A = this chain, B = another copy of it.
Amino acid sequence: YPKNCLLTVMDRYSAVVRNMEQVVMIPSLLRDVQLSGPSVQDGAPDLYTYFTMLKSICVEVDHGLLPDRISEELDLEAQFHLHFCSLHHILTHLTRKAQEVTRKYQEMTGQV
């Protein structure tokens, strides 16, 4: 498996996030650390929210995936989910269709 492929990328991510969780011993220290890099009020998303998202995506990566504009940064979990789900749905659909092609050929050449 090549170094630049999605699957290698998946467990590099999983390794980094697991390391992140070993290191971040007192996660409440991340509350109130701004995302912007120190317009953002009290009560908005911060570094702890982000840390949480990272962990949350990692939980899905680890389960093999079972179904200003830092506001784009937090849409990432939703986007990720959209992508991984539609991959799942495409391959599932195509797996069935490939079976139908195999059956059709067998039929055509009188194997059944």
Interface of A, helix, strand, loop or mixed by DSSP: helix
A44 is an interface residue with CB less than 8 A from chain B = no
Residues of B within 8 A of A79 (CB): 86, 90
Partner of A54, one of B17, B66, B98: B98
Is A33's CB under 8 angstroms from B104's CB?
yes
- A94 near B13 (CB under 8 angstroms)? yes
CB pair B23–A102 under 8 Å, yes or no, is yes
Least CB distance from A95 to B in Å reads 5
What are the interface flags for A88-112 relative to B under an 8 Å C-beta threshold, 1 for contact and 0 otherwise? Answer: 1011111101110110111011000
Instruction: Tell me if A64 counts as interface (CB < 8 A to partner B).
Output: yes
Q: Quick one: closest B residue to A29, CB to CB? A: B108
Task: Report whether B83 and A90 are in contact in the complex, using a CB–CB cutoff of 8 Å.
Answer: yes
In the bound complex, do residue A1 and residue B101 qualify as a contact, i.e. CB atoms below 8 Å apart? no
What residues of chain A have their CB less than 8 Å away from a CB belonging to chain B? 1-2, 4-10, 12-13, 16-17, 19-20, 23-24, 26, 29-30, 33, 47, 50-51, 54, 57, 61, 63-67, 76, 79-80, 83-84, 86-88, 90-95, 97-99, 101-102, 104-106, 108-109
